[PDB]
Amino acid sequence: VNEVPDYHEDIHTYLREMEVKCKPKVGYMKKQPDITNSMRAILVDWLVEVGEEYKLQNETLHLAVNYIDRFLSSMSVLRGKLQLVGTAAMLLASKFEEIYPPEVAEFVYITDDTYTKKQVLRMEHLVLKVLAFDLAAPTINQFLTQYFLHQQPANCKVESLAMFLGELSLIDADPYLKYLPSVIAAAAFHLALYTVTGQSWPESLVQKTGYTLETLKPCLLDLHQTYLRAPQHAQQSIREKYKNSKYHGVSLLNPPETLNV
Amino acid sequence: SMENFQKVEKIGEGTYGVVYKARNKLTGEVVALKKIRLTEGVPSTAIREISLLKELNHPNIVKLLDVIHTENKLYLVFEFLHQDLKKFMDASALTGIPLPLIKSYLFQLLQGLAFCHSHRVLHRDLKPQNLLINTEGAIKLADFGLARAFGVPVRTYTHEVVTLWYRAPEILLGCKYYSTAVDIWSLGCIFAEMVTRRALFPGDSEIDQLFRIFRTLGTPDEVVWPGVTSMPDYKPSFPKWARQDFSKVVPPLDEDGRSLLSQMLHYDPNKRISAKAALAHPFFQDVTKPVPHLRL
Ligand SMILES: CCn1cnc2c(Nc3cccc(Cl)c3)nc(N[C@@H]3CCCC[C@@H]3N)nc21
Domain boundaries, chain A: 10-23+137-261, 24-136
B35 lines ligand 1 (CB under 6 A): no
Q: Exposed, middle or buried: residue B93 (CB in 10 Å: 0-12, 13-18, 19+)? A: exposed
Q: Where are the beta strands (DSSP E) in chain B?
A: 5-13, 18-24, 30-37, 64-68, 73-79, 83-84, 121-122, 131-133, 139-141, 148-149
The verdict on whether residue B221 carries a ligand-binding annotation is: no
Q: Please say whether the beta carbons of B161 and B172 come within 8 A.
A: no
Q: Do A99 and B158 touch (CB under 8 A)?
A: yes
Radius of gyration of chain A (CA): 18
User: What domains does chain B contain, in order, with CATH numbers?
Assistant: 2-82 (3.30.200.20), 83-293 (1.10.510.10)
Q: Do A95 and B44 touch (CB under 8 A)?
A: yes
Interatomic CA distance for residues A73 and A67, integer angstroms:
10
DSSP for residue B153: S
Q: In this structure, how many other beta carbons lie within 10 angstroms of the beta carbon of residue A192?
A: 26
Q: How far apart are the first and last CA of chain A?
A: 37
Read off φ and ψ for residue B63, nearest 5 degrees. Answer: -95, 125
Q: CA A16: distance to chain centroid?
A: 16
Which residue type is seen at A229? R
Whether residue A175 has a cis bond before it, omega within 30° of 0: yes
The verdict on whether residue B54 carries a ligand-binding annotation is: no
How many CA atoms within 13 Å lie on the side-chain side of A210?
4
Q: Please say whether the beta carbons of A205 and A211 come within 8 A.
A: yes
Q: In this structure, how many other beta carbons lie within 10 angstroms of the beta carbon of residue B151?
A: 20
Q: Do B177 and A8 touch (CB under 8 A)?
A: no
Which residue type is seen at A33? P
How would you write chain A as a 3-class SS string?
CCCCCCCHHHHHHHHHHHHHHCCCCCCCCCCCCCCCHHHHHHHHHHHHHHHHHCCCCHHHHHHHHHHHHHHHCCCCCCHHHHHHHHHHHHHHHHHHHCCCCCCHHHHHHCCCCCCCHHHHHHHHHHHHHHHCCCCCCCCHHHHHHHHHHHCCCCCHHHHHHHHHHHHHHCCCHHHHCCCCHHHHHHHHHHHHHHHHHCCCCCHHHHHHHCCCHHHHHHHHHHHHHHHHCCCCCCCCHHHHHCCCHHHCCHHHCCCCCCCCC
Interatomic CA distance for residues B144 and B124, integer angstroms:
8
Q: Considering CB atoms only, which of A14, A15, A136 is closest to B52?
A: A136
Q: Considering CB atoms only, which of B44, B149, B157 is closest to A136?
A: B149
Residues of B that are catalytic: 125
Listed in sequence order, the residues at least 6 apart from A129 whose beta carbon sits closer than 8 Å to its beta carbon are B69
Q: In this structure, how many other beta carbons lie within 10 angstroms of the beta carbon of residue B100?
A: 14
Collapsed DSSP state (helix, strand, coil) of residue B212: helix
Q: With both helix axes pointing from N to C terminus, report the angle between A58-72 and A117-131 in degrees, rounded to the nearest 10.
A: 70
Which residue type is seen at B190? I
Q: Please say whether the beta carbons of A19 and A138 come within 8 A.
A: yes
Which residue type is seen at B110? L
Q: Please say whether the beta carbons of A5 and A12 come within 8 A.
A: no
Q: Please say whether the beta carbons of A35 and A77 come within 8 A.
A: yes
Question: What dotted CATH number matches A24-136?
Answer: 1.10.472.10
Q: Considering CB atoms only, which of B42, B44, B179 is closest to A1?
A: B179
Which residue type is seen at A89? A
Q: In this structure, how many other beta carbons lie within 10 angstroms of the beta carbon of residue A130?
A: 15
Q: Which residues pair with B79 in a beta bridge?
A: B31
DSSP for residue B49: H
Which residue type is seen at A1? V
- What is the atom index within ligand 1 of the atom nearest the CA of B82? 10
- Find, among B179, B148, B177, B184, the residue nearest to B277 by Cα: B184
Q: Do B151 and A145 touch (CB under 8 A)?
A: yes
Which chain A residue has the Cα nearest residue B149? A136
Question: What dotted CATH number matches A10-23+137-261?
Answer: 1.10.472.10
Strands B64-68 vs B121-122: parallel, antiparallel or unpaired: unpaired
Question: Distance (Å) from the C-alpha of residue A131 to the closest C-alpha of chain B?
Answer: 10
Question: Distance (Å) from the C-alpha of residue B268 to the closest C-alpha of chain A?
Answer: 10
Collapsed DSSP state (helix, strand, coil) of residue B141: strand
How would you write B270-290 as a 3-class SS string?
CCCCCHHHHCCCHHHCCCCCC
Whether residue B251 has a cis bond before it, omega within 30° of 0: no
Q: Exposed, middle or buried: residue A144 (CB in 10 Å: 0-12, 13-18, 19+)? A: buried
Which residue type is seen at A100? Y
Q: Which residues pair with B31 in a beta bridge?
A: B22, B79
Interatomic CA distance for residues A257 and A224, integer angstroms:
9
- Find, among A29, A28, A31, A66, the residue nearest to A47 by Cα: A66
Which chain B residue has the Cα nearest residue A107? B40
The four Cα atoms A96, A243, A2, B166 give a dihedral, to 10 degrees, of -50
| Topology match between the domains A10-23+137-261 and A24-136 | yes
Q: Which residues pair with B34 in a beta bridge?
A: B19, B76
Residue nearest to atom 6 of ligand 1 (CA): B81
Interatomic CA distance for residues B258 and B264, integer angstroms:
10
- What is the atom index within ligand 1 of the atom nearest the CA of B14? 20
> CA B102 → CA A206, A212, B127, B191, B287, distances in Å?
44, 49, 15, 8, 10
Q: Which of B5, B10, B18, B19 to mutate to test the pocket of ligand 1 (most atoms within 8 A of CB)?
A: B19
Residues of A in contact with B51 (CB under 8 A): 96, 133-136
Question: Could you tell me the sign of the dihedral formed by the alpha carbons of B80, B86, B90, B94, in that order?
Answer: positive
Which residue type is seen at A241? K
Question: Could you tell me the sign of the dihedral formed by the alpha carbons of B259, B261, B263, B267, in that order?
Answer: negative
Q: Which residues pair with A252 in a beta bridge?
A: none
Which residue type is seen at B148? R
- Find, among B164, B100, B43, B152, the residue nearest to A139 by Cα: B152
Question: Could you tell me the sign of the dihedral formed by the alpha carbons of A231, A234, A235, A236, in that order?
Answer: positive
Radius of gyration of chain B (CA): 20
Q: Please say whether the beta carbons of B166 and B129 come within 8 A.
A: no
Q: Do A6 and B276 touch (CB under 8 A)?
A: yes
Q: How far is the CA of A97 from the centre of ligand 1 (A)?
A: 28
Which residue type is seen at A167? E
Q: Please say whether the beta carbons of A11 and A54 come within 8 A.
A: no
B107 lines ligand 1 (CB under 6 A): no
Q: Which residues pair with B10 in a beta bridge?
A: B20
Q: Please say whether the beta carbons of B51 and A135 come within 8 A.
A: yes
Interatomic CA distance for residues A62 and A169, integer angstroms:
10
Q: In this structure, how many other beta carbons lie within 10 angstroms of the beta carbon of residue B25?
A: 11
> CA B187 → CA A88, B240, B250, distances in Å?
38, 26, 15
B134 lines ligand 1 (CB under 6 A): no
Read off φ and ψ for residue B183, nearest 5 degrees. Answer: -75, -30
Q: Which residues pair with B73 in a beta bridge?
A: B37
Q: Please say whether the beta carbons of B124 and B161 come within 8 A.
A: yes
Q: In this structure, how many other beta carbons lie within 10 angstroms of the beta carbon of residue B137?
A: 15
Q: Which of B7, B60, B81 to mutate to test the pocket of ligand 1 (most atoms within 8 A of CB)?
A: B81
Query: Structure resolution in Å?
Result: 2.7
> CA A155 → CA A187, A192, A223, A254, distances in Å?
17, 10, 21, 17
Question: Could you tell me the sign of the dihedral formed by the alpha carbons of A7, A153, A56, A24, in that order?
Answer: negative
Q: ∠ CA(A193), CA(A6), CA(B214), 5° rounding?
A: 115
Q: Please say whether the beta carbons of B296 and B135 come within 8 A.
A: yes
Q: Do A7 and B117 touch (CB under 8 A)?
A: yes
Q: In this structure, how many other beta carbons lie within 10 angstroms of the beta carbon of residue A241?
A: 18
Q: How far is the CA of B13 from the centre of ligand 1 (A)?
A: 9
Listed in sequence order, the residues at least 6 apart from B43 whose beta carbon sits closer than 8 Å to its beta carbon are A95, B16, B36
Mutant choice from B1, B39, B120 vs A, greatest count of A C-beta within 10 A: B120
- Find, among B132, B245, B113, B120, the residue nearest to B184 by Cα: B113
Q: How far apart are the first and last CA of chain B?
A: 29
Q: Which residues pair with A66 in a beta bridge?
A: none
The four Cα atoms A102, A103, A109, A114 give a dihedral, to 10 degrees, of 110
Listed in sequence order, the residues at least 6 apart from A211 whose beta carbon sits closer than 8 Å to its beta carbon are A182, A183, A186, A201, A205
Interatomic CA distance for residues A73 and B286, integer angstroms:
53
Q: Which residues pair with B121 in a beta bridge?
A: B149
